[PDB]
Structures are given as structure tokens and as C-alpha cells.
Design a protein around this ligand. Structure first.
Ligand SMILES: Cc1cc2nc3c(=O)[nH]c(=O)nc-3n(C[C@H](O)[C@H](O)[C@H](O)COP(=O)(O)OP(=O)(O)OC[C@H]3O[C@@H](n4cnc5c(N)ncnc54)[C@H](O)[C@@H]3O)c2cc1CS
Ligand SMILES: Cc1cc2nc3c(=O)[nH]c(=O)nc-3n(C[C@H](O)[C@H](O)[C@H](O)COP(=O)(O)OP(=O)(O)OC[C@H]3O[C@@H](n4cnc5c(N)ncnc54)[C@H](O)[C@@H]3O)c2cc1CS
Ligand SMILES: Cc1cc2nc3c(=O)[nH]c(=O)nc-3n(C[C@H](O)[C@H](O)[C@H](O)COP(=O)(O)OP(=O)(O)OC[C@H]3O[C@@H](n4cnc5c(N)ncnc54)[C@H](O)[C@@H]3O)c2cc1CS
Ligand SMILES: CCCCCCCCCCCCO[C@@H]1O[C@H](CO)[C@@H](O[C@H]2O[C@H](CO)[C@@H](O)[C@H](O)[C@H]2O)[C@H](O)[C@H]1O
Ligand SMILES: CCCCCCCCCCCCO[C@@H]1O[C@H](CO)[C@@H](O[C@H]2O[C@H](CO)[C@@H](O)[C@H](O)[C@H]2O)[C@H](O)[C@H]1O
Ligand SMILES: CCCCCCCCCCCCO[C@@H]1O[C@H](CO)[C@@H](O[C@H]2O[C@H](CO)[C@@H](O)[C@H](O)[C@H]2O)[C@H](O)[C@H]1O
Ligand SMILES: CC(C)=CCC/C(C)=C/CC/C(C)=C/Cc1c(C)n(O)c2ccccc2c1=O
Ligand SMILES: CC(C)=CCC/C(C)=C/CC/C(C)=C/Cc1c(C)n(O)c2ccccc2c1=O
Ligand SMILES: CC(C)=CCC/C(C)=C/CC/C(C)=C/Cc1c(C)n(O)c2ccccc2c1=O
Lengths: 429, 429, 429
């Protein structure tokens, strides 16, 4: 029985571990995670709004993973020795591996002066919770609201979802008229999402904001978040201020120190994310795989204010399906290799209703896109939450019917047989 | 009995006077106006188009106000002595006052050079009927038509109405293809309206115009209107001209000389409009109130070309309602003071169809907006006119059911209890 | 018998010749054409896509024309001597005329460097059949496609068609996601078509390109087309580059030499196109008339990158009716002159669906427009093709019913009685 160590107990890690397990019962699998729970991240904005209890959107891992014959180690992974094939945890426990899957997700950078002190974030359950405590003060004393993304940000979705969910909340409380709302993004235009748009997203989102009276400034670098104002800089280099009593800003992401310590064949020097090829396998150390946000994928377009590419839920689900297959195939001496399609369904919950975004694939050129908005989309996200948590709880992230439902509805094929894995992830075999 | 004097027989004046008489049957009211008729301004564009007889959209006041025990003075109020509590008329007749309501509407400034001479306006019924003559000449032998708003304009609606009405008319006599149409405006973008747009009004008006082949220039200053052309200036300081056989440009507004005649405590030095607080009361002379266009309200937005903020019929009806209660509460020694909501239902007639706008409030940030378009809206404009005229003739501008109706359909309340009057009108109390 | 000579076996020539035949059976008519067949130009993009066989979209003229007493000479008109009322052919045959109709269509100019040998065009049948061959080269070797219009272009429609149709095909073959697409135009914005847009056509095309992932660069000047790339130049004169495995660009138009061989009273000194008045008649030589693409019509607006006005089928077949009547009324001593209305009804085919455009007249100011999209519009283009070729084959381009159907469905009269022809073609009597 070969040994696969997975670092990181999130969407990517869980999915790779369950994929490997369901494809090969006679396989020793160890998962290492610094958090004792899997957290459902797409529900963090709602948690930040106080519309979710943490226990509803999390699954304790240590009592669960043994049920699927997976070893859970509840520590941080400190370093990787890819020559020795070894992972070292923080307490000093060394673990040998035959294959390694890195899935540590994003490491937050609050790159704006004062952002970490005077702003709020929704990227972790921990941050989402101290956001909730702060919104409490906004409702009590309605001042101006500023929301958005700093330079380097690569996950733009949640900030739109927060802006619009907050609008809804204030409007339910009959105080929206006491609260100006500005959205500031490093995107060249609204609805760029770090992907150069999804269909006519720029137009869909611009009307959404105009209809719901949400002022916006795009194509600018947010430099500072003071207790009382947000300072930013446009392409001429002049700085501007905007009054703000409450702010929520997306951090930019970088890779973790664990990856960094594997050397510059594994760790991308620029951002410390995991160097991978079309097959989400490391070029140099071919028993190392990266899955999820931590994977180094080049941007789709070099925008005037730096932006990066989002790794969304469905993309990662495909990454995990491809890496699991490629590991299994290597073990079984099958030369076949798979690249993930990297397509994305994306639902942005605006409170009462929601935006549906489908891009196939996400990195252009695209075969097709779907942009729709409705109440149905909001229910779909609540359903999907309930559904994903059940998958984590029942040992299968990729039940065969999900694949076929996605075929019938969207003509989506999650992974393809790759003829040549040498090349940037996202680039076409 | 206490003595209140209403200066001005327009929307605000009549509304305020009627509300007072209905709250307090035994209160003496004197209304002074320089016109023996009440002008229904919302129908003046149709009068310029020749779809109304002046007699149908006017109400003679002399035989009417004495029916509600309102003393009518058919003279111009010349000066105001606020320390001596007196108004002095054109013939020099001194009338003393306990309370003063100023509702003199706008003093028109034809601020582009050559505008009074070479252009038409639709602001007064005199100018409207004049415009009718010029349209006749136009139909006889077509030429370029340019319509719009100069710098300083705060009433954009009627220009949009007129452009689109004139379109429908030129088209219905098959002569449109021989008539270019350009709309040039001081608004930063189309459908800004001085209010920073209403929902996605900017997208909606740009589409209306493109469909109806109306050319447009926004964010420029009309500097000159000549017999043959219109000269305007963009933000670089560059001059451009546009050929024109017929022009109709909106003048800008300023306070009258009668207001100016009271100190710099009643008359806003920058524009001669009445200094009022949240409760539409003068900060220093507590027995002076302003209603309607005459009131100084800070612009919602400093736009690159100076624009002001409209005071719509519903906004004014609300002002008048708030002021009535404020005066009566003060007479009765009741500490309750009321702010108007300053929301707008605004219908722009386009000939056979029309655009329905609803802003709550008008001054951002907004609780909600409605922007719809259709036939029904045009018919609702004809029917509201008939309704409003009936209101003036029957001594109630504010019957109880009307408020309940607006509450049921739009969830609007015309007036709020104001915790503290001290602050700019429109600002949140 | 008077003798009318038509140069041009295309839409313009045929429709003038047929029209004259139906108005005057005893009139002598001679058609000079270098090509032995009428080509149904609107179906050339489909021919390039390989969805038509040449034989289906063309009519042999040599056997056909004698059936309507039209003498067909299959040679290229070489020179026109307006002082001798003659036309000399490539063999040397001098033909006299009492009236002349110039309808040679466009002489293609491949302005960009490398355009003629490296790009491909769809403007003639030979060029279109040649493009099919290169499209084969692409389907087997997926690479970047770029498509558009060079400076000075005037037929933008076929490029939009082609881009869209090509997208449809790439999707059919499942290779769309392996093939980027960029549309590069001299138009100031998308959907300008050299007409200052039709209705809200800019919003419409932009949105069309977004859903389908066709990138675009507008308001630039294409200067080079190399085997592996396209070089364009922006308004700052800064020179840019984009990769290209396959290209397809519209050439600009100029007048033929046969026109140039007459005075500069007949050939416009700037473009060699035929000088005509409102009545598509030459101001100097009153018995010379021009029909179709060869006619000199001023640009609707002076665009940052030069552009021209399209001459669409409906416009041309209206020139033909106007010119016809003008020759007939001269023969019959009727002082009456007609101008064509010049309204367009242009269906842009996209493969499985299509874009309906109606502009009446094409040249602003307009009486009305209709811009719509759907499957029906695609079945309408196929239907119209079958219908038009029937008209060619059956000898009447303007059946009475067709004008009455146009009247009651679009309120379209094809010609207007014109009190004064002296002026630019397309300007208003
Ligand atoms: C706020 C927010 C919302 C959000 N919403 C999404 C949505 O509505 N739809 C969607 O499709 N995607 C959404 N995403 C993005 C994406 O789905 C999420 O970021 C995923 O959660 C990312 O998955 P990953 O597997 O890449 O990372 P992870 O966050 O699930 O967690 C990885 C695990 O690794 C652990 N870990 C970190 N560092 C470690 C070290 N050194 N050693 C051991 N383990 C380590 C960590 O505990 C975690 O369990 C959305 C994204 C956001 C965020 S801003
Ligand atoms: C052309 C035009 C159309 C128009 N349409 C509107 C619409 O469709 N909907 C809407 O909500 N608002 C529209 N408005 C704006 C608004 O409704 C009008 O401007 C109101 O008429 C403004 O009300 P006011 O009471 O502020 O002004 P008034 O003009 O009705 O009455 C002023 C009265 O005062 C008299 N007066 C002036 N100076 C005096 C002195 N010194 N002494 C005594 N009396 C004086 C004056 O004669 C009049 O009776 C629309 C607005 C327009 C117009 S530009
Ligand atoms: C590729 C392409 C597509 C296209 N599609 C159109 C569409 O879908 N709808 C529409 O309304 N218009 C479309 N057009 C534009 C226009 O309708 C066409 O170009 C017409 O064919 C123009 O008609 P004309 O009569 O102006 O020209 P013609 O092309 O038919 O050719 C006239 C004839 O003259 C002959 N000829 C040239 N030189 C001669 C000399 N010296 N002597 C004698 N005869 C000569 C020539 O052989 C031809 O028989 C569309 C336009 C395009 C094109 S890029
Ligand atoms: C057990 C396996 C089954 C898994 C479930 C699979 C998901 C099923 C997909 C359902 C299709 C969703 O996509 C569907 O889109 C259309 C819009 O085009 C929406 O329909 C909407 O149409 C128009 C606006 O366009 C509205 O006037 C209408 O009120 C609304 O219903 C549907 O409400 C939505 O459901
Ligand atoms: C004593 C009671 C009398 C007081 C008056 C009470 C007010 C009455 C309410 C009026 C009804 C509202 O007006 C209604 O607006 C909706 C907006 O979705 C329109 O709904 C629809 O109309 C047509 C299609 O039918 C479209 O142009 C439009 O896109 C669409 O919104 C209705 O055509 C219109 O009739
Ligand atoms: C005997 C010779 C005479 C034959 C000529 C008859 C022509 C009749 C067509 C005139 C009608 C106008 O053109 C009409 O545009 C409307 C736009 O609302 C389309 O109306 C509709 O299109 C399709 C369904 O048909 C829908 O996707 C769309 O939502 C809807 O708008 C019609 O499909 C089209 O026919
Ligand atoms: C509107 C039309 C035509 C179709 C919609 C119906 C669809 C797409 C049904 C598929 C249901 C399904 C299992 C989707 C998979 C799905 C995945 C895999 N991820 O990762 C998500 C992440 C965030 C939000 C939503 C999703 C989501 O819906
Ligand atoms: C489409 C939806 C959801 C609702 C529409 C139904 C509505 C708005 C009903 C309200 C009817 C009503 C009594 C309106 C009062 C009303 C007022 C008070 N003013 O001042 C106007 C000024 C100009 C033009 C129109 C008006 C108008 O309609
Ligand atoms: C959508 C609406 C309101 C009406 C549909 C328009 C209809 C039914 C028009 C009548 C049909 C008809 C005989 C049109 C004549 C017609 C003409 C005269 N020309 O020149 C064309 C050129 C290119 C493509 C199509 C045409 C075309 O359809």
C-alpha cells in the first residue's frame, strides 16, 4: 500500500483524499491540517452577516476521517524535504510520503497600510466572526461603508457578495438611506473577477449597483485604510480619500512557508505558491501535486492594477479529480495522465436573490458562458451548501451522478486525458 | 387668530396655504402672487407642444381662494423686513406677518450668452406659448434642432420630456428625417438628473435616445446660443459648435430680489435662495419657512460642470406638508417638528408612452428606486394632471386617502418627526 | 428607340436594367459586365464558411438576359467618353448610349502591408473560395484568429457576420477553446458600421461579443498583416501587435479606372467613385447615372480613423428604382425627379441565429430603427436569398407586391418625389 500525505483539510485536500480513497481502498492516506475542522468557505460571507452559526458550516475532522480509513493529524505542516520525501510538522513529527498533495489554500496578505488593524475580512471563519461584531456597530451608528479589493487580489466574488448582502441587510433594517456605500476595486472595470469578465458580467454588475445605489471606483490601488477613511491611488499617481466608518477588503493571497521551504523548484519565488504543470503535478519532483488556491496559476490578463486568477470551488473539485487519478495511475503503472478542465459555476448571493456565472473554461478562450440572475440562484446556493457538507460528511466529494448531472445540464467534462503535461496550468494540452 | 403670509401662488404656495387652512380653520392666511392664476407647471411642455389650452391647465385664484378663507393679493412681493415682521408689495402696501412662507419658485437666469434672445424656454406659460410659435416655423421648414441644459441647471426632466415629445411630433408628421436632434447637457452623463441618476436611468436614457436617433453631448458647458448655432465647451477648454434652426434650453435658477432684500441671514449669498434647515425653517428667523424651488438645497454632487438638485412636485408637496405642521405646532406650542421625506415620483411624458421614475429619497443614499417605462405611465400623467387641478379647485392638496394610497403602493411616508432641525435640508435628521 | 447602357452585372446593374425593362418594354438596354454571372453577394460569407456551393448563389447571365430583351456583352468596360456618349471595351468595341448607368461596384484596395498575400477576404466569390481553403488549414491547426476592417473601410457588416459565423463553427467542431478570437476595427466603436450606429447597436454587438468571447480593439488603424501577426496603430501613433494563425480583413473601396477615364466631373478626385446628386445623376453630364457601391456618398461623420458609408442591397435597389424613373421621365418629358429613400434592412447572420437591423433612412437623421435578434432572422436571410435569386432569374427586381409588403410592415416608401436634385446624394430635398 503506497502512502499519500495530503497537507490541508479544505475543499482541495478533502476532495483529493476522498478521491484517492474511493479509487483505491488499499491505500494509506494521511491528512495534515492546522484546523480541526473542514470549513465551508462559500458560507463565510453569510456567517459574517450573522446568518449562519459556525457549527452549521463546519465538520470536525478527527472523529470523521478514520471512518474513511484516513489518518488525521491535527497540526501545522512546518516544512517539506522533497529530496528525502518527508513532511515535518510543527511539533517535530516527521512523516514519510510516496506522493504529496499540497492544499494549504490561501495565505492572507493585508497589503494596504492599516488594513489588518482598521478593516475587516471574511476569508476565514475567524475573521468573518470579528466582522460580525463590527457590523453590529455600523447598524447602531450608521456611517459610510467602503468595500472592495486591494491590488494583487485574485478572489473578487466574495466582496461583491458582501456589498450586496450588506445592502439587503441594511434595507431590511430600514436604515440603508443613512448609509452611503462605495465599492473600490483593483479590477479595470466591475465584473472583471480577475478573469477578464464572464460574458456580459461588466454590464450585469454595473446595473446591479446602479439599481441598488452602490457607488464604485474601479481601476485604482487602495493604499491605506484609516479608522475614518480609505486612501487610494489612480494610474496618474494622485491619491484620493473617501470617508469610511466600516470597511471590508479582500486581502491578496500568497503561498505558505511550508511550500517555500521545499526550494524554488516547488515554491514559485514570486508568490510562494506551488509550481505545477497542466496536470497539477510539479515539473521537478513528479510525486508532488498541488491542488487548490495554493497552486501557482499565471493571470489571464496583465491589468493596469495587478490582479490574479480566482481558483473557485468547481475548479478545485476538478483539480482534485485529476491529481487523484494521476497518483493512482502512477501507482498502477498506467501512463495515462489527466488535466482538469478548470471550468466554474459561480453563484453570488445578493441576499434575497443571486447571480449565476458559468464559464467553460475560466481561462480564455471559452467554449461558452452563462450569466443569469434570479431568486432561484439564491436557493440553489443554500441547497448546494447543504449538499457539499453532506459530501464531506459521507466520504465522497465526487459522486458519479454529479458528473452526469453536470453533463446533461452544461455539457461539462471535469477532466481530460492529457497528451503532454509540460506547460502552464490552464494551458491547452 | 394668528397671521401667516404665503408668498407665491404656485405648487408650494397653494399647498402650504391649503394645508394650513385645513389644520387650522380659524387661522388667517394671506397669499400674495404676481399672477392671477395658478400655473400647473407639469403640463407646460405640452403647452409648448400645443396639446393643451392654457385655460385647461390653469386656475384663476381671485374667485377661488376666498372660498377657503384665504386672502389673495394679486401683486408682486417686493421686499421682506424680517426683523420688523413685514412684507412690502409692488404698489408699496405693507402687510404684517406672524409667520412667513416663501414659495416664489425660481427666478430664471438665461446664463448662456444669446440664450434669452435666440432660444426658447418652457418654464413659464408665457415662454411656453412663445415656443409654440417657434415650433410652427420649424415644422414649416425643418432644420437642425438642439435642446438641453446650460451650466447651473437643476431641472433637467422637462428638457428630456420636450426632446422626446418633439421627437414623437416630428415623427407623426413624417418630417423627422429632415430634422436632426442633438441633446447637449451639463449633466456628467445622460439621466444624471442632478441627483446622480435614478437606478440605472443612465443606461435607460442612453438607450431611449439611441433608439430614437437623438444625438447627445454630456459633461459640457453651453456657452453661446446664436441664431444659426450653439457653441459649447468641454472639460479641456475646447470650443465646439453645432448647427441649430431651433433651440430650447433650460435656464438656471436663482433666488429672487424679494428674498435678497431680507438680510444675508435669510438669503443664501451664493444664489439668493432661502436659507432653510431640515424642517425647512430659517435658522435665524424662526417664523420664516421656504417651500419649493426657492429653497437653498446643497447639490447632491459637485459635478465637473455645475449642476443643482431638482425640487419636484412631490418633494414640494412634502415640504409644504412639513411646514404646515411646523407652523401649527409652533402656534399650539407643540415641540414636535417635521422633516419632509423628500422622495420623488416623477413621470416623464414621451408623447404616447412615458418613463416612470421613483426615488426614495431623491437625495442619496436611497432606500429604493423604481425606473419603469410604458404607455400606462403616459395615461397616468394625463390623469394625475386632472386630479391635481381638481385638488387646487377644491381646497385640499393633501386629502387623507392620497397618503394611504402612496403608503400602500410605495411604502412611503411624506413627513418624519425631526429630532433636531439644525443641518442642511435633505440631510438625515 | 433610346439606348440605355448599364455597366455592371451585379445588384445595382441588374436592378436598374430590369426596372427599365418593366417601365418601358420598347427601350433598348445593353448590359456590359466582365463576369459572366450575377453573384449573390450577401451569401459570400456563407460560401467562405463552406455552407454554399457557388452554383446555388449565382446566375449565368448569357442565357438569361436575352429572355428580357437585354443585350449582354461579357467584357470589361474600359473607358467612358462622356463628350461622345460612348463606352469602349477591353477588345476595343465602342458602344454608344443615350443614357449611361455606372454600377461596377467596389474596386478592392488592400491598404495594409501584407494584406493581399497574407490575409484573406470574402468580397468576391474567388476570394471566398480561397478563404474556405485557409479555413481548412485552421480547423486542423488551431491558433489565434483575428478579423476586422482596415482604415477607410465602408462594409463592416460582412466582417461581423464572418467573425460570428466562424465562432459558431469552432464551437461545432469543439475547438473553440483552442482558438482565441480578436475583432479589430477602424470604427470608433463596435456596431458603428460607418453609420454612427443603428439604434442601440453598440450596446448590442458589444454584448454579443462578450457572451461569445470575441475580444476586440476599436478605433485603431491596421497597418500590417504578417504571416504570424497583425500590427495596428492607435491614436497616439503608438504601434501594437497581436498573434495570428488566421486573419480576414475587409479591404477599403475605390472607384474603377473605367470611371476615372471620364472627367473629374464624373470621377471624384479623392476616391475615383462616381459623382452624383440627390437623384443619383451626375450634375454635369445629366444623362449619366450611378447606381450602387461605385457611387460617391460622403461619410456620415468624420471618424478618428477614416470610415465610409455602406451601400447595402436595399439602398442600392432603391437607387435603381430612382435612376430608372429618372431615365424614363427624361425620355417621356416629365420634369419630375425621384430620390431613393435609402433605407436599409440588413440581416447579420451568425450561423444558427441572426441580427435584424432596420434603419430608415440609413443616413441620419432617422425616422425609425429596429434592432432585433433571433433564430427567425436567420431563416429570413436564407429565405431572402432564395427569393432574390428568383427575382434575378425571373426578370423583375421590384414586384409590385414587394413594395406593398414593405409599406405595411415597415412603413417604407422606396423613392420620394424630389423638388431639387442639386446637392449631395443622401441629403434631403
Ligand atoms: C470568503 C470566500 C468565499 C468564497 N466563496 C466561494 C464560492 O461562493 N464559490 C466558490 O466556488 N468558491 C468560493 N471561494 C473560493 C474557494 O472555493 C475557497 O477559497 C476554497 O475554500 C479554497 O480551497 P483550498 O482547498 O484551496 O483551501 P481551503 O481554504 O479550503 O483550506 C485549505 C486547508 O489547509 C489548511 N492549512 C493552511 N495552512 C496550512 C499549513 N501550513 N499546514 C497544514 N494545513 C494548512 C487550512 O486549515 C485549510 O483547512 C471563496 C473563497 C473565500 C475566501 S476569501
Ligand atoms: C416646464 C416645467 C415642467 C415641470 N414638470 C414637472 C413634472 O412633470 N413633475 C414634477 O414633479 N415637477 C415638474 N416641474 C418642477 C416643479 O413641479 C415646478 O417647478 C413647480 O412649479 C415648482 O413649485 P414652486 O411653488 O416652487 O414654484 P411655482 O413656479 O409653482 O410657483 C411660484 C409662484 O410664485 C410667484 N412669484 C414669483 N415671484 C414672486 C414675487 N416676487 N411676489 C409674489 N409672487 C411671486 C409666481 O408667479 C408663482 O405663482 C416642472 C417645472 C417646469 C419649469 S421650469
Ligand atoms: C462580402 C460582402 C457581403 C455583403 N453582404 C451584404 C448583405 O448581407 N446585405 C446587404 O444589404 N449588403 C451586403 N453587401 C453589400 C452590397 O449589397 C454588395 O456589395 C452588392 O453586391 C453591391 O452591388 P453593386 O451592384 O454596387 O456591385 P456588385 O458587387 O454587384 O458588382 C457589380 C458588377 O460590376 C462588374 N464590374 C466591375 N468592374 C467592371 C468593369 N470595368 N466593367 C464592367 N463590369 C465591371 C462586377 O464584375 C460585377 O458584376 C455585402 C458586400 C460584400 C462585399 S465586400
Ligand atoms: C437530482 C439532480 C438534479 C439537480 C438539479 C439540477 C439543476 C436544474 C437547473 C434548473 C435550470 C435553472 O435555470 C433557470 O433559468 C431561468 C432563466 O433563464 C429561470 O427562469 C426565470 O425566467 C425569467 C427571467 O429570465 C423570469 O421571469 C422567471 O420568473 C424565472 O423563473 C429559472 O428560474 C431557472 O431555474
Ligand atoms: C383609489 C385607487 C386609485 C389610485 C391609483 C393606484 C395605483 C394603481 C397601480 C398602477 C399599476 C402599476 O402599473 C403597472 O406597472 C407594471 C410594472 O411592472 C407594468 O408591467 C409591465 O407593463 C408592460 C407589459 O404589460 C411593459 O411595458 C413593462 O415592461 C412591464 O413592467 C404594468 O403595465 C403597469 O400597469
Ligand atoms: C406574403 C409575403 C409577406 C411575408 C412577410 C411577413 C413578415 C412578418 C414578420 C413581421 C413581424 C416583425 O418581426 C418580428 O419581430 C418580433 C420581435 O418581437 C419577433 O418576436 C419574437 O421573436 C421570437 C419568436 O417569434 C422570440 O424569440 C422573441 O422573444 C419575440 O420578440 C418575431 O419573431 C418577428 O417576426
Ligand atoms: C440555468 C441552467 C441552464 C442550469 C443550472 C442547473 C445546474 C448548473 C445544475 C448543476 C448542479 C450542480 C451539482 C452544480 C455544481 C456546483 C459546484 C461543483 N461548485 O463548486 C459550486 C460552488 C459554488 C456555488 C455553486 C456550485 C455548484 O453549483
Ligand atoms: C409599478 C409599481 C410597483 C407601482 C406604481 C403605482 C403607484 C406609483 C401608485 C401611486 C399613485 C399616486 C397617488 C401618485 C401620487 C403622485 C404625486 C404625489 N406627485 O407629486 C406626482 C408628480 C408628478 C407626476 C406624478 C405624480 C404622482 O403620481
Ligand atoms: C420585425 C418586423 C417589425 C418586421 C419584419 C420585416 C418584414 C416582414 C419585411 C418584409 C419582407 C421583405 C420582402 C423584405 C425585403 C428585403 C429587401 C428589400 N432587402 O433589400 C433585403 C436585403 C438584405 C436582407 C434582407 C432583405 C429583405 O428582407
Amino acid at each position: 500500500a503506497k502512502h499519500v500525505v495530503v497537507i490541508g483539510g479544505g475543499v482541495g485536500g478533502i476532495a483529493t483524499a476522498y478521491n484517492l480513497r474511493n479509487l483505491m481502498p488499499d491505500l494509506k492516506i494521511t491528512l495534515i491540517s492546522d484546523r480541526p475542522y473542514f470549513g465551508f468557505t462559500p458560507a463565510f460571507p453569510h456567517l459574517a452577516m450573522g446568518w449562519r452559526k459556525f457549527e452549521d458550516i463546519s465538520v470536525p475532522l478527527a472523529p470523521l476521517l478514520p471512518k474513511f480509513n484516513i489518518e488525521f493529524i491535527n497540526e501545522k505542516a512546518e516544512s517539506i524535504d522533497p529530496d528525502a520525501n518527508t513532511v515535518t510538522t510543527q511539533s517535530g513529527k516527521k512523516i514519510e510520503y510516496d506522493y504529496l498533495v499540497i492544499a494549504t489554500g490561501p495565505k492572507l496578505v493585508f497589503g494596504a497600510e492599516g488594513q489588518e488593524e482598521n478593516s475587516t475580512s471574511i476569508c476565514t471563519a475567524e475573521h468573518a466572526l470579528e466582522t460580525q461584531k463590527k457590523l453590529q456597530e455600523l447598524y447602531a451608528n450608521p456611517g459610510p461603508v467602503v468595500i472592495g479589493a486591494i491590488p494583487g487580489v485574485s478572489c473578487f466574488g466574495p466582496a461583491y457578495e458582501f456589498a450586496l448582502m450588506l445592502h439587503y441587510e441594511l434595507k431590511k433594517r430600514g436604515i440603508r438611506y443613512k448609509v452611503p456605500m462605495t465599492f473600490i476595486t483593483s479590477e479595470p472595470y466591475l465584473g472583471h473577477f480577475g478573469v477578464g469578465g464572464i460574458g456580459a458580467s461588466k454590464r450585469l454588475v454595473e446595473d446591479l449597483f446602479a439599481e441598488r445605489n452602490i457607488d464604485w471606483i474601479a481601476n485604482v490601488a487602495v493604499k491605506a485604510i484609516e479608522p475614518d477613511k480609505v486612501i487610494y491611488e489612480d494610474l496618474n499617481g494622485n491619491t484620493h480619500e473617501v470617508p469610511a466608518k466600516f470597511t471590508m477588503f479582500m486581502p491578496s493571497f500568497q503561498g505558505p512557508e511550508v511550500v517555500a521551504s521545499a526550494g524554488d523548484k516547488v515554491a514559485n519565488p514570486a508568490n510562494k505558491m506551488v509550481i505545477v504543470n497542466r496536470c497539477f503535478q510539479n515539473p521537478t519532483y513528479k510525486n508532488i501535486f498541488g491542488v487548490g488556491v495554493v497552486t501557482a496559476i499565471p493571470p489571464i490578463e496583465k491589468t493596469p492594477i495587478p490582479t490574479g486568477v480566482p481558483k473557485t470551488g468547481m475548479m478545485i473539485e476538478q483539480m482534485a479529480m485529476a491529481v487523484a487519478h494521476n497518483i493512482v495511475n502512477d501507482i498502477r503503472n498506467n501512463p495515462d495522465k489527466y488535466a482538469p478542465r478548470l471550468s466554474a459555476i459561480c453563484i453570488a448571493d445578493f441576499g434575497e436573490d443571486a447571480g449565476f456565472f458559468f464559464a467553460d473554461p475560466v481561462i480564455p478562450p471559452r467554449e461558452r458562458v452563462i450569466t443569469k440572475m434570479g431568486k432561484w440562484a439564491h436557493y440553489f446556493k443554500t441547497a448546494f451548501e447543504k449538499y457539499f457538507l453532506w459530501k464531506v460528511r459521507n466520504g465522497n466529494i465526487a459522486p458519479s451522478f454529479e458528473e452526469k448531472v453536470l453533463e446533461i445540464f452544461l455539457k461539462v467534462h471535469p477532466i481530460e486525458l492529457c497528451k503532454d503535461c509540460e506547460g502552464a496550468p490552464g494551458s491547452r494540452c
